[PDB]
Amino acid sequence: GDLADRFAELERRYDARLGVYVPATGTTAAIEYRADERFAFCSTFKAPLVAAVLHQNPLTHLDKLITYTSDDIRSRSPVAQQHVQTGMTIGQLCDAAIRYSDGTAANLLLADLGGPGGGTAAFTGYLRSLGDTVSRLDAEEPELNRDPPGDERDTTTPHAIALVLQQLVLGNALPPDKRALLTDWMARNTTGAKRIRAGFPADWKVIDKTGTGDYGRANDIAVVWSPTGVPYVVAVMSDRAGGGYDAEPREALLAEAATCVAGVLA
């Protein structure tokens, strides 16, 4: 119908593949467009990664110091760059991973979660513990952003990652104290202003984690709250694989998809 046609026009205009999922609520039907097609996580995985590390350990574990060297920085790492000599705490790594999408921070958290070699498997296992049987993480940073189109490695679906974020932020996957850390870090993020946030009116609260990658990949996952406090979860994923590995991502595509959703939820 109308919404499907609107989303299709976005795909034509941006020369992109778009995926959208918004779970049903008691008064709204699910919004679904390519919701069960796989799309690369890119940095969206960092949100559930932090949740996994929070869940697996006591609060005092956030103060554990992790050391590393400049040879460990193999991805865009705006925070970890500055702390090679000192190390960073698990807590500082979580902050960096969410708020700066720091790649080395995410790799170090993976290693904390699953050991050397076992991180991506352990991360995927955490998603399994949340009832996500579809998503998979296979490589670390930066390779996870760079898989060829069609490859199932390092992919989720709008549907799957929406339900994950829903459990983490709106459900009881984490105890409230841990849930609030995750939520707060997402609230203070420095990369999502032009994505789902840009599709919702200013009196709606939005917290999000972005992802960006090769093949014009641009994703955003969010929880939003209406002016009266009614929550919804919004996943928007995109790629422009037709343009090749260096295709330009289009944040505006996500903002527009979000505007369509906001129009329905208003």
Residue numbers in the entry: 27 to 57, 59 to 83, 86 to 145, 145A, 145B, 145C, 145D, 146 to 238, ...
From the paper:
pmcAntibiotic resistance mediated by β-lactamase-producing bacteria has become one of the major threats to global health. This phenomenon has substantially reduced the efficacy of β-lactam drugs, which are the most commonly prescribed antibiotics worldwide. β-Lactamases (EC.3.5.2.6) are a group of enzymes that can hydrolyze the amide bond of the β-lactam ring, thus making the antibiotics inactive. One such residue, at position 105 (standard Ambler numbering), is suggested to play an important role in substrate discrimination of class A enzymes. Interestingly, BlaC, the β-lactamase from Mycobacterium tuberculosis, possesses Ile at this position, sparking the question about the evolutionary preference for this amino acid. Mutation of Ile105 to Arg in the β-lactamase BlaC simultaneously enhances activity for carbenicillin and the ability to evade clavulanic acid inhibition.
Comparison between BlaC I105R and wild-type structures indicates a minor repositioning of the active site residues with one important difference. The newly introduced arginine at position 105 adopts a conformation that differs from the isoleucine in the WT, moved away from the active site. Consequently, the access to the active site is broadened. In principle, this would allow for easier accommodation of both substrate and inhibitor molecules, but it can also lead to an augmented dissociation rate of the initial Michaelis complex in case interactions between active residues and substrate or inhibitor have weakened. Furthermore, we investigated whether any structural changes in I105R would be detectable in solution using nuclear magnetic resonance (NMR) spectroscopy. In agreement with the observation from the crystal structure, only the 102 to 106 loop, harboring the mutation site, experienced large chemical shift perturbations. In line with the observed MIC value, BlaC I105R showed improved activity (kcat/KMapp) for carbenicillin (2.7-fold increase) but impaired hydrolysis of nitrocefin and ampicillin (4- and 3-fold reduction, respectively). The positively charged guanidinium group of the arginine side chain might act as a “fishing pole” in attracting negatively charged carbenicillin molecules through the carboxylate group on the C6 atom. However, even long and charged residues, like Arg, can serve as a viable replacement, as demonstrated in BlaC.
